[PDB]
Each structure stands twice: as C-alpha cells, then as structure tokens.
Amino acid sequence: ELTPDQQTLLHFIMDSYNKQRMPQEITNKILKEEFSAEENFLILTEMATNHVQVLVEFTKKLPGFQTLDHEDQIALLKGSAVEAMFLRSAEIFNKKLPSGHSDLLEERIRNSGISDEYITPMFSFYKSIGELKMTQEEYALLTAIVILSPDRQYIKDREAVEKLQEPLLDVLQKLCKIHQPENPQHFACLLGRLTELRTFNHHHAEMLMSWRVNDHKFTPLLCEIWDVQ
Amino acid sequence: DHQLLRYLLDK
Ligand SMILES: CC(C)c1onc(-c2c(Cl)cccc2Cl)c1COc1ccc2cc(-c3cccc(C(=O)O)c3)sc2c1
Numbered sequence: 001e002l003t004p005d006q007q008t009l010l011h012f013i014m015d016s017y018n019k020q021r022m023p024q025e026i027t028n029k030i031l032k033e034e035f036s037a038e039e040n041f042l043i044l045t046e047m048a049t050n051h052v053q054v055l056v057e058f059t060k061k062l063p064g065f066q067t068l069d070h071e072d073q074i075a076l077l078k079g080s081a082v083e084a085m086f087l088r089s090a091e092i093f094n095k096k097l098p099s100g101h102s103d104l105l106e107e108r109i110r111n112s113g114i115s116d117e118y119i120t121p122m123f124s125f126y127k128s129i130g131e132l133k134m135t136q137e138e139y140a141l142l143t144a145i146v147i148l149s150p151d152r153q154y155i156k157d158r159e160a161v162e163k164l165q166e167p168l169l170d171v172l173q174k175l176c177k178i179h180q181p182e183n184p185q186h187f188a189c190l191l192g193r194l195t196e197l198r199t200f201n202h203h204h205a206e207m208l209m210s211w212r213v214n215d216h217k218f219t220p221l222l223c224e225i226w227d228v229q
Numbered sequence: 230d231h232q233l234l235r236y237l238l239d240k
Contacts, residue, residue, distance in 0.1 A: 053237065056234070056237040056238065057237075060238060066238075070235070070238075073238060074231050074234050074235070077234055078234075220233060221233050224231055224232075224233045224234060225233075225234060
C-alpha cells in the first residue's frame with residue numbers, strides 16, 4: 001500500500017517527468033506555423049529531436065540508470081525511443097496537455113507524409129489508450145518501464161535492467177490496486193498496451209524509409225538514435 | 230559510434 005521506499009521512488013520520478021523540458025517558444029510552433037505537408041514535417045522533426053533530449057535527461061535521472069554498462073545505456077535508449085515517443089504524444093491527445101496543442105498536432109501528423117496504413121493504427125492506438133483514462137503517474141511510470149525494458153535487442157546484461165525495472169512495475173501495480181480496486185484487471189490492461197506499443201517499432205521503420213526515399217531530412221540526433229543510415 | 234547519445238549522457 002505504498003511503503004516509504006516507494007512513496008519516495010514515485011516522487012523522484014514525478015519530479016523528473018514533470019520538469020518542463022520542451023521550451024514554450026518551440027512547442028508554440030505547432031500552433032502558429034503554416035499548415036502544409038513540408039512545414040508539418042519539419043515541425044514534427046523538431047519536436048521529436050527535442051524530445052530525444054528530454055528523454056535522455058529523464059532517463060539519466062531514473063534510479064540506477066547511470067550505474068549501467070555504457071553500451072547498454074545506448075541499447076536501451078535506442079530501443080525505447082519510438083515507444084516512449086508514442087506514449088508522450090498519446091498523453092498529449094488523451095489528456096489534452098496545453099503545451100501539445102492536441103488538435104493542431106493531430107492536423108500536422110495527418111499531413112506529414114505518413115501512409116494511411118500507419119495513420120489508422122496509430123490513432124486507433126491513441127483512442128484506446130485514452131479510454132484507460134490514465135493518470136500522469138501512470139504515464140510516467142509507464143514511460144520509465146518502457147525505457148528500462150530488459151527485452152531490447154543488443155542488451156549485454158538483461159538482468160541488471162530487469163532489476164532496475166522491477167521496482168517501477170511494483171509501484172505501478174500498487175498504484176493500480178490502490179485507486180482502481182473496482183477492477184483488479186487494470187494493471188494487466190496497461191501492460192497489454194505495452195504489447196500494442198511494440199507494434200509501432202516496425203511501422204516506424206517503414207515510415208522512415210518512405211520519408212527517406214522522398215528526400216526528407218531528420219537530424220544528426222534522430223538519425224543516431226533510430227539508426228538512420 | 231553513437232557519440233551524440235554518449236555526449237548527452239556525459240553532459
Ligand atoms: C521525425 C518526426 C517527423 C517523427 O517521425 N515519427 C514520429 C512519431 C509519430 Cl508521428 C508518432 C509517434 C511516435 C513518433 Cl517517433 C515523429 C514525431 O515524433 C514526435 C516525438 C516526440 C514528440 C513530442 C511532442 C510534444 C509536443 C508538445 C509538448 C510536448 C511536451 O513534452 O511537453 C511534447 S510532439 C512529438 C513528436
């Protein structure tokens with residue numbers, strides 16, 4: 001029922017997760033710039049390359065992350081990049097965060113060179129995850145769990161990560177049985193979405209190919225993290 | 230390789 005070691009872990013996490021890292025002058029472009037396929041794409045590239053920085057600075061703050069093998073630290077970042085980004089945007093659409101300009105962010109994604117084959121699943125995903133009516137603690141706990149996934153390919157010590165992940169799952173499960181006793185299946189549902197999240201890694205690899213064969217520019221930072229040759 | 234990510238971590 002939320003011990004000390006936990007009421008403290010959660011607070012350190014809600015602390016990081018809550019730092020307003022993305023600059024207002026930057027996210028404001030989602031609202032003020034012209035709406036065209038090219039501009040929508042450039043702005044989305046700028047949000048994503050800025051978000052990569054917020055993630056790393058959030059990940060660094062995750063308990064015991066900095067004690068992991070430097071090679072694994074990369075594998076984890078490269079592995080969860082896409083998923084963590086879907087989680088953040090999902091929160092923008094689901095909980096209508098002001099800094100996200102939800103409806104205008106959606107206009108730009110729906111017209112940035114992405115095939116209907118991916119737009120449909122993508123938004124279908126956002127709708128059902130919103131129906132879980134999650135809290136900021138769940139979103140944050142969820143992201144930290146995704147980043148610390150011992151599953152990611154190329155990990156050298158898949159047990160030192162599980163060990164760093166376990167505490168987080170525990171606090172999430174607890175927080176579920178606590179304010180959601182109504183139904184003891186909520187923890188399971190959240191974890192279910194994790195599986196659905198994974199699905200977009202493939203989709204994202206195809207989206208990048210399409211953008212690339214169409215002469216689209218990313219950033220040195222995005223290219224490194226997504227392995228864009 | 231991955232000098233950008235490494236650079237962000239060491240920052
Ligand atoms: C390179 C780019 C064109 C791209 O390619 N695929 C995807 C993608 C798309 Cl469509 C959907 C899901 C995942 C990916 Cl990876 C993207 C866009 O990725 C991003 C990544 C992070 C953020 C954070 C935002 C944001 C806004 C306001 C406020 C905040 C805030 O944290 O306060 C965050 S928008 C945004 C857009």
